[PDB]
Design a protein around this ligand. Structure first.
Ligand SMILES: O=C(O)Cc1cccc([N+](=O)[O-])c1
Ligand code: NI
Ligand code: NI
Length: 257
């Protein structure tokens, strides 16, 4: 019964999931000066035109916007990837304050939040099988800074009062995730893991260099969510980010010079 507190937070997770101290854990600090530009990298293809969003769920640690992943409707390909990766969900990690919240850091800088678009490799048939493979998932990571509002985020923000507590869901159809992407698809990539239990080492991370801007008011609404279930004492859903982990024997590659 894990979480983000003093008593059950990241620094405890290794007792249940020894892989927490493994060789390819996430997130990491991205040292921009030491990331090497990789010309082998194939260009990134994000094909979200046919995406079908279904539902938004408060899972007790974040909220997930879930997609129909029963066909190739929203797919990621290219970049460092071999093959086709299907969108299953996106979620965010965020802070109690604007000065923290992202999982990845960039030269030690923390952003206010980070968006994760989670995709699984279709060669494995479903998500559950894909998470058991070293190349099972591709997560596209996007940093959020506080400034102007992000218009394409407002639909998400406005439904959050309907999913305040753990286990609540709401219908969330017709949401276009293209409205959450920055202009540029320049990226860093490295092999890593999920950042909550069970911490599986199944992720190719693709972290975009260009942040998106969201307003103060938008991020404030994230911070009104609750970790707890209805009828339990209120504990605000904030600081649901794992801190940077050791890079160990990994290289971070850049798609750009
Ligand atoms: O890495 C995370 O944010 C945690 C996490 C936990 C469980 C599933 C997830 N997913 O990628 O579908 C992500
Ligand atoms: Ni538990
Ligand atoms: Ni995540």
């Amino acid at each position: 019964h894990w979480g983000y507190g003093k008593h059950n937070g990241p620094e405890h997770w290794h007792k249940d999931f020894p892989i927490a101290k493994g060789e390819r854990q996430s997130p990491v600090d991205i040292d921009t000066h030491t990331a090497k530009y990789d010309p082998s990298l194939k260009p990134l293809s994000v094909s979200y035109d046919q995406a079908t969003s279904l539902r938004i769920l408060n899972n007790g640690h974040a909220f997930n916007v879930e997609f129909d992943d029963s066909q190739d409707k929203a797919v990621l390909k290219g970049g460092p990837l071999d093959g086709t990766y299907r969108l299953i969900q996106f979620h965010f990690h965020w802070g109690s304050l604007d000065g923290q919240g992202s999982e990845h850091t960039v030269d030690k800088k923390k952003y206010a939040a980070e968006l994760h678009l989670v995709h699984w490799n279709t060669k494995y048939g479903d998500f559950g099988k894909a998470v058991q493979q070293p190349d099972g998932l591709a997560v596209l990571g996007i940093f959020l800074k506080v400034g102007s509002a992000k218009p394409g985020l407002q639909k998400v923000v406005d439904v959050l009062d309907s999913i305040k507590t753990k286990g609540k869901s709401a219908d969330f159809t017709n949401f276009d995730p293209r409205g959450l992407l920055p202009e540029s698809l320049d990226y860093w990539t490295y092999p890593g893991s999920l950042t909550t239990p069970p911490l599986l080492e199944c992720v190719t991370w693709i972290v975009l260099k260009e942040p998106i801007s969201v307003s103060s008011e938008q991020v404030l609404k994230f911070r009104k969510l609750n970790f707890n279930g209805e009828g339990e004492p209120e504990e605000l859903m904030v600081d649901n980010w794992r801190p940077a982990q050791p890079l160990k024997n990994r290289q971070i590659k850049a798609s750009f010079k």
